[PDB]
Amino acid sequence: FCRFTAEGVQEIDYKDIATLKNYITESGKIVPSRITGTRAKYQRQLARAIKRARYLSLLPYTDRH
Amino acid sequence: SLSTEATAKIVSEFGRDANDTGSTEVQVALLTAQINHLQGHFAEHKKDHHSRRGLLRMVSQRRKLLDYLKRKDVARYTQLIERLGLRR
Amino acid sequence: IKVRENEPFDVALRRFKRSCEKAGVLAEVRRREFYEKPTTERKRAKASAVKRHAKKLARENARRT
Amino acid sequence: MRHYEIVFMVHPDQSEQVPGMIERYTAAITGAEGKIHRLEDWGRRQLAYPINKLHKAHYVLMNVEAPQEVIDELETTFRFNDAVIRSMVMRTKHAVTEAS
Amino acid sequence: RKQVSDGVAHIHASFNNTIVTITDRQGNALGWATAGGSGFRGSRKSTPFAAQVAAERCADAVKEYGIKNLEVMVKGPGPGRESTIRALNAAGFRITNITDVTPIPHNGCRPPKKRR
Amino acid sequence: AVVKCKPTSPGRRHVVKVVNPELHKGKPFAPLLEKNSKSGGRNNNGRITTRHIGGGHKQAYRIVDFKRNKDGIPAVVERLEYDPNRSANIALVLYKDGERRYILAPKGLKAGDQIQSGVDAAIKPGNTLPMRNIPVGSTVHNVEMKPGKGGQLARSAGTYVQIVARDGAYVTLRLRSGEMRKVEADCRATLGEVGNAEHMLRVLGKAGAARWRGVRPTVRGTAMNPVDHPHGGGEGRNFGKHPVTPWGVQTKGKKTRSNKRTDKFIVRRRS
RNA sequence: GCUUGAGUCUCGUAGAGGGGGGUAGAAUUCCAGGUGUAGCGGUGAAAUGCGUAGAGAUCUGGAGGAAUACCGGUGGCGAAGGCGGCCCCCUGGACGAAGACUGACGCUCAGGUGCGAAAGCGUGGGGAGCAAACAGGAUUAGAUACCCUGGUAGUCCACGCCGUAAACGAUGUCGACUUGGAGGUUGUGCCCUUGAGGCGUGGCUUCCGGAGCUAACGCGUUAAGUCGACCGCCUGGGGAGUA
C-alpha cells in the first residue's frame, strides 16, 4: 500500500544503496511489489538496480558468502 | 539504423523541399538506404531471422511503392531506378 | 536465515526461517521440473484465487446466521 | 558519440596508485575528443562478498561521454590489468554529474 | 582432547536421516552422531525423536573437548530440525547463534524425475 | 574452405579438398629454403626403423622461426604460404629492418597484420610473450619447454593449449591431449590457436592420396605368417591371441611411459 | 483530383523481440588435502550401491558443464514456434503527443518462398546434473512397468538436415457497427503536485456479464452477435489418413 517514486518522481539509480536496502530482506532477496506497493514500472527498474548492486558488491546476493 | 541526419539528407535530395518526406521517390529511397545498410548486418551472423522479416517487409513495401510509381508515371519511375541502382 | 534473540531467549523463536521459505524452494527443486507443470499449476492457481475473491465481493446474501 | 557510466574496482595494494589510472584513462578519452564529466572516487570501502580474495576494495566512478572505439579498448585495458577487478560500463541516459 | 573452548554444531537433517556433527570454529570435526546410528532403523530413522536422541548421543564424546558455547548449522528440511536443537540446548550447552546453511541453488542443475 | 568433389570417377567420389584461397600460389621465399631428402624409415644402419614410410612427392624444407627471438622490432605479415613439411600454414613476415622470417600462422591472421615479439608486446594473436606476462586463462600456441629451446608444444594445425595456473616460477598448462603439464615461466609462447583448423576435415579419397603423402601400405598381423608376425597363422581367418605389436609388446592398452625424470613436471595424465 | 484507408518524417515510451561477445553469484559433480568416526544412501519396508583401502559429515584450495532462486505478476514482447541473472555491439517490431508530406500506393491470396516446439539425423567439440536404451536390486501369481541404485544416446555448443505437435483462445486474414461493469500494463491532455490526487483521451490484455447467437456447453465490443472481401477445409464410421 506504500508508495515510492511513482509520486516523488526520480529515476532509479543503482548507486544510492541506502534506498535499495529498504527493498531487500535480511537474506538479500528482492521484496515483491505486492508487499511494498510499488508500481510495476519502477519494480522492474528496481530489479535491475538490485542485480547491478549485487554485481558491484554493494549489496549481497545472500548472507552465506 | 537510418539515423536522423541520414534521413534529413534523403528528404532534401529526393523530395521537392524539406517538408516533402512522404513522396514515393523519398519513400523508396528511404527504404533502399535502410536495406543497403542492413545488408552488412545480414552479411554477418547468418541467423537473425526476426529482423530479417522486418527487412523482408520493407523489401515488399518498396516493391509495392515502386509498382505504384511505375503505373502512375513511368518518367519518374525510370528516373528513380537509375538513381538508386536497382530493378534488374 | 539468521536469528539471535541476544540474551533473553530460552526458546528458538525461529520464525525468520519461515519468513522467507525454509521449506518452500527446497521442496520444489528436489524433484519434478516438467518444464510444463509450473505453467499449468500457476494458470489454475490465480483462476481459483480470483473466484475466491469474486465470491469475496459476492457474499452479500442474508444466509440467516 | 554516446554517454557512458564506467565503474571499476581496483586491488587494494594499488590503492596508493588509484590516482595514477585517472590521468592515464581520462587522457585516453579526452585524446579521442571524449568529454569527462565525473571523477567521483568513493575510496576504499567494504565489499558485500569476498571477490577472488580478501575484501575491502577501492571504487572509482568515471561516467564519461565517449565514442565507441575508445570505450572497448579501455575495457581491454581493464582485462589485462591485475589491479582492476570487475569493471562495468552502463547506458547513455544523458550522463549526469550527481548522486555521490 | 585438546580442551577446546568453543565450536560449531552442524546439523544435516535430510529427508530420511538427520546427521548431527559438532566441529570447531575452523570446521574440524570433533565427533558426530546420527539418527540411524542411534538404533531406529527404517521408518523410525526419519522422525524428530531420532534427531533428538542423535543430539543426546552427540552431547557426549565431546565432553573431553570441554565445549561450553556453540553455533548451530541447520541444513536440509528434516523430520526434526527443531527437536535436535531443543535437546542440544538442554544438553548443557550455550546456543549462541543459529543460521540456515541449506544449499539452495539459483536454478542450477536439473532435478530428477523419480518417485512417480 | 571445405569443398566436396563430384563423383566423376572412382577415387574421386569420396574426395574432400581443403582449398584455402589466400595461400600464395607462387614460389616460396628462396633464401629460407633448403633441401630435405627422404629417408624412407631407414637409419644410419640402413634398416627400416619406422614402417610404412617411403615414396611421396618431393618437398623442400622451410626454415620456420620458432624461437621468435626478434624482440622489440614489429613485423608485418607479407603473405600466407603452404608448408608441405607441416600440417599447418606458415606466415612470411617482414620485419621493420628488412629481415624476412617464416612463422607458424595463427588462426586469425591476414596479409597485412602487424605482429611483434619480446616482452613488451601487447596481447594480440601472433605476438610471442613469456607466460608470466600472458594472462592466465588465455589460449596460446608454439609453447617452449625450456628457456630459449624454441617452442615444441601445440604446433599442428588447429592445436592449442590453455594457461590454467601460474604459481611461482612454474606455469601449469592444459595440453591439447588433455594433460596438465608444468613448464618454466621463462619460456615463450605465441598467443592464439594455430591456423588451418579445417585440416582434419580432409578425406584422402583414394589409395594413391596416402601413397604420395610418404605413407606405404600397412599389412595386418592376421594376414601375416607366424614367422613374420606374432599373430600370423590362420586356416580361415583364425586369430585366437591377445593383440600385440610385431615385436611381442602388448597393444590395445599398455602404458609404455617409463621416464622417471620428466614426471615431476606432469600433474595429471590424459584421460 | 480530394482525404476520413494505407504509408513517410519529426519528439518520446515500454518490452524475456532477434543475433553476436564477455562477465557475476548460488548450487550440483569431480580432484587434492586437513579434522573426524561407523555407518551412509534409499524405501511403505528392504536390498542392489557406497564404507575400516577409511565412507557419510565439516573446512580449505582447485577444475569443469548447465541454468539463472528472489524480482516474477491470466506481467511483457514476438506473425507463429517461442523468448526471462547482468553488461558491450548490431538490429527488428509495437505504442503515444501535436504537426508536416505522398495521395487509394489497399485487402486477401492457389502455386511459390521463408520461419517453424521437442524428439531424431550428418560433421566437429563438450559433457556437471538429468536421462531413453541397458544392468542390478525390489513389488507381484507373473512385472523385460510404476519403486530404488547406477547408467549410454541425448539434453549443451558451431554448421547443415528433418518440417513434424493437443503447432489449441481446438475459433483463418482484413474492415465497419452493436448494452456494460470490475482490474492489470503502457503513453498522453487538462485541473491544484494545492495532500499516498481528480477529470478525459489511445495501444495491449484478464474476468464477469445485457441484447444477439448456438443443439447445449458457452461466446458475448480481442463475439461463436449484426454485414462485406478472399483463401483453405468437410460430406456417415471402420478400412485409413493405409497401400
UniProtKB/Swiss-Prot annotation, chain D:
Molecular function, one GO term: structural constituent of ribosome
GO biological processes: cytoplasmic translation
Species in which this protein is naturally found: Escherichia coli (strain K12)
Subunit structure comment from the entry: Part of the 30S ribosomal subunit. Interacts weakly with uL2 in one of the 3.5 A resolved structures.
Modified residues (N6-acetyllysine): K93
Function of the molecule: Binds together with bS18 to 16S ribosomal RNA.
GO cellular component, one term: cytosol
Name recorded for this polypeptide: Small ribosomal subunit protein bS6
Entry's family note: Belongs to the bacterial ribosomal protein bS6 family.
From Swiss-Prot, chain F:
Origin: domain of life: Bacteria
One of the record's GO molecular function terms: RNA binding
GO BP terms: cytoplasmic translation; negative regulation of DNA-templated DNA replication initiation; ribosomal large subunit assembly
Residues bearing PTM N6-acetyllysine: K241
Name of a matching Pfam family: Ribosomal_L2
Region (Disordered): 27-52, 220-271
A single Gene Ontology CC term: DnaA-L2 complex
Keywords annotated in UniProt: Acetylation, Ribonucleoprotein, Ribosomal protein, RNA-binding, rRNA-binding
Biased segments, Low complexity type: 38-47
Family note: Belongs to the universal ribosomal protein uL2 family.
NCBIfam families to which the protein is assigned, alphabetical: rplB_bact (TIGR01171)
Quaternary assembly: Part of the 50S ribosomal subunit. Forms a bridge to the 30S subunit in the 70S ribosome, contacting the 16S rRNA. Interacts weakly with S6 in one of the 3.5 A resolved structures. In pull-down experiments interacts with CedA.
Function comment: One of the primary rRNA binding proteins. Located near the base of the L1 stalk, it is probably also mobile. Required for association of the 30S and 50S subunits to form the 70S ribosome, for tRNA binding and peptide bond formation. It has been suggested to have peptidyltransferase activity; this is highly controversial. In the E.coli 70S ribosome in the initiation state it has been modeled to make several contacts with the 16S rRNA (forming bridge B7b, PubMed:12809609); these contacts are broken in the model with bound EF-G.
Further remark: This protein can be partially replaced in vivo by its H.marismortui (HmaL2) or human (L8, from the 60S cytoplasmic ribosome) homolog.
Protein name: Large ribosomal subunit protein uL2
Recorded name of the encoding gene: rplB
